[PDB]
């Protein structure tokens, strides 16, 4: 089997992804953000507390003849930047884009912390990254993803994510008109649970390649690219006026800049990020200093490839039994 489901900028600055998600029968369709750096499908549900719903669409599992609960389990999770939500578990039937796993796990929110409330446009997440990090308790659960490996033509999934446009999430299999060139393959560490992989260095703008090695994580759940200091010291370096701004909580730089673009290594491979993409708009409403996307990793004890590094290539998440990664431009 397979599937393929487009997966749209929730607003014009591309801050995530949303894409919809068949839930229960009859179906419910959520649309979900789909993330490769956690492993919980939870969503928005008729148990949230009202006063932290505005505006989600929500599944109602007692509309659902599929819907069970699942005995005694709950779930909680915490993400990297703060946010929280946890509740309890139904198994249920799941399609994304024809392809269907009969009695996934669907963590119901009971409670959300106040940046989902406030999203009104994600319904939920879809975690993509290792079952090893999924939050059910007593009994850890598994994600899409893995449900579905075995059923799939072949066991991998793609990213495909669009600069202000959509783009599309593929299940089991490889769309060859999707990408340029080749797709180039490099190692992942499955040990923290992530797609965790190691970029062979960088350039900025028209500049000199550095080779080195950086160690990261391919999160299509967090929205920017987070390197070491150094590198994203040498970044803004390159852009009249950019600075660190302590208050606002990273680099800003004039809005009436032309960004420089900023490349990757991948292997021997590069994949080239647009300076354009690097931009995410003022501040705050009418300010002339906007916010980058490239920032500091160094508060965060991981490098993060997020949806700025991604959007600029085809992605491979490949879950063969030694799992890999591909990158290819397009
Ligand atoms: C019981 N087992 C051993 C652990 C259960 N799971 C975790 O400890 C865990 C930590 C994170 N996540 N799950 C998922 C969201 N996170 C992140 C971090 C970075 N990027 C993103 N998108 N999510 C951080």
Do not use: M
Not at 70 to 84: E, F, K, M, Q, V
Not at 208 to 215: L, P, W, Y
Not at 306 to 315: E, P, R, Y
Request: hydrophobic share 35%.
């Amino acid at each position: 089997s397979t599937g393929s489901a487009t997966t749209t900028p929730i607003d014009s600055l591309d801050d995530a992804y949303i894409t919809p998600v068949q839930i229960g029968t009859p179906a419910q369709t959520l649309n979900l953000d789909f993330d490769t750096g956690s492993s919980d499908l939870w969503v928005f549900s008729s148990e949230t507390t009202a006063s932290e719903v505005d505006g989600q669409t929500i599944y109602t599992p007692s509309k659902s003849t599929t819907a069970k609960l699942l005995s005694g389990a709950t779930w909680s999770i915490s993400y990297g930047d703060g946010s929280s939500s946890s509740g309890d578990v139904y198994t249920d039937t799941v399609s994304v884009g024809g392809l269907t796993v009969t009695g996934q796990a669907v963590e119901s929110a009971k409670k959300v912390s106040s940046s989902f409330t406030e999203d009104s446009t994600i319904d939920g997440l879809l975690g993509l990254a290792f079952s090893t990090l999924n939050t059910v308790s007593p009994t850890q659960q598994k994600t899409f993803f893995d449900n579905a490996k075995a059923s799939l033509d072949s066991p991998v999934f793609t990213a495909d994510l669009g600069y202000h446009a959509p783009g599309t999430y593929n299940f089991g299999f490889i769309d060859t008109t999707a990408y340029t060139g080749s797709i180039t393959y490099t190692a992942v560490s499955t040990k923290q649970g992530f797609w965790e992989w190691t970029s062979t260095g960088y350039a900025v703008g028209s500049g000199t390649f550095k080779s080195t090695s950086i160690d990261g994580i391919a999160d299509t759940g967090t929205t920017l690219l987070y390197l070491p200091a150094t590198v994203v010291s040498a970044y803004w370096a390159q852009v009249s006026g950019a600075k660190s701004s302590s208050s606002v909580g990273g680099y800003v730089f004039p809005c009436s800049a032309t960004l420089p673009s900023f490349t990757f290594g991948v292997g021997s491979a590069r994949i080239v990020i647009p300076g354009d993409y690097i931009d995410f708009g003022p501040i705050s409403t009418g300010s002339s200093s906007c916010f980058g996307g490239i920032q500091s990793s160094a508060g965060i004890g991981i490098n993060i490839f997020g949806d700025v590094a991604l959007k600029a290539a085809f992605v491979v998440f490949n879950g063969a039994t030694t799992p890999t990664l591909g990158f290819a431009s397009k």
